[PDB]
Design a protein around this ligand. Sequence first.
Ligand code: W32
Length: 317
Amino acid sequence: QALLRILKETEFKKIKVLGSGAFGTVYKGLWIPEGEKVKIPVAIKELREATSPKANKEILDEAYVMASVDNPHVCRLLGICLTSTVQLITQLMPFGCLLDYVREHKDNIGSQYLLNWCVQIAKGMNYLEDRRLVHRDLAARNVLVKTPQHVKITDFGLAKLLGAEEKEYHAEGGKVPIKWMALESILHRIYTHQSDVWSYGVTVWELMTFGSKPYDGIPASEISSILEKGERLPQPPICTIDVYMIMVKCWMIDADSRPKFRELIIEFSKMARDPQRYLVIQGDERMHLPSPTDSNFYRALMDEEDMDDVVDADEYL
Ligand SMILES: CS(=O)(=O)CCNC(=O)C1=Cc2c(ncnc2Nc2ccc(Oc3cccc(C(F)(F)F)c3)c(Cl)c2)NCC1
């Protein structure tokens, strides 16, 4: 009945690889709670190791905060398994990430959906700020689709868990998502809720460009000098200046001057009330989102025979 379940290796199975990232590698899997008689679809993240790793109790302590979160727009940790590696277990979101979703469905996404996503992301980030948990890796890749009209943030607090605020991580070959990072994070490893704001601006940009790569082609080693010269991501073609100004504010050098998440919830909520005033999308009025389960991503994950007879984590808990 633990908030953070300590799962035995025998309790869960990695079924297929999803992909790798800076902080680790994710798998589709099944969780079979020990005494019970159900199979629950889970994502399983196995982390990158360190030469001088943290003690288990310290890892458990940070993971507890990740399991403690209770908000509609934030994913929560269901379990953890410590061995020679750290493995994190969470409810599988089979519609996939919002980044893949905008890239796939560009021609059917209207202004209402895009603005509603921005609100939802800002609400989840405001909830993390209430929990005093800096995300440190907000990006469109770390926003997951529950339904086309409901998205959730994941992967918060991992950069802290892995020691990316200290020099040792970086000296030992560790990498961080530079093209999403506030300038003060790049230069001095400062991470606050206001550095998350910057990464929020980048996320919104990714959304409004239907999943373009920020500073595409520009080497990561050149990013700090580019930012220092005042250069920023360009206005997305669909955005009025009112919307781009918000993104621009999120990337001010003075972190204290950037909008707050509580402010962004209000501003994007006002825009979502009159979406066609703020985003200019051809055919906006006549745009229909495909049935969520008819998406390629969902079928690709769930139709496998290994996924025999399963119960959604929401229905089980
Ligand atoms: C570009 S790619 O190909 O590399 C993308 C690779 N990933 C994918 O395709 C997908 C992954 C995917 C998913 N459902 C559910 N979680 C997922 N990932 C994921 C992400 C992070 C995780 O660790 C946490 C770390 C800290 C907090 C939390 C917590 F939970 F508290 F928020 C979780 C864990 Cl365990 C899983 N569904 C499919 C989409």
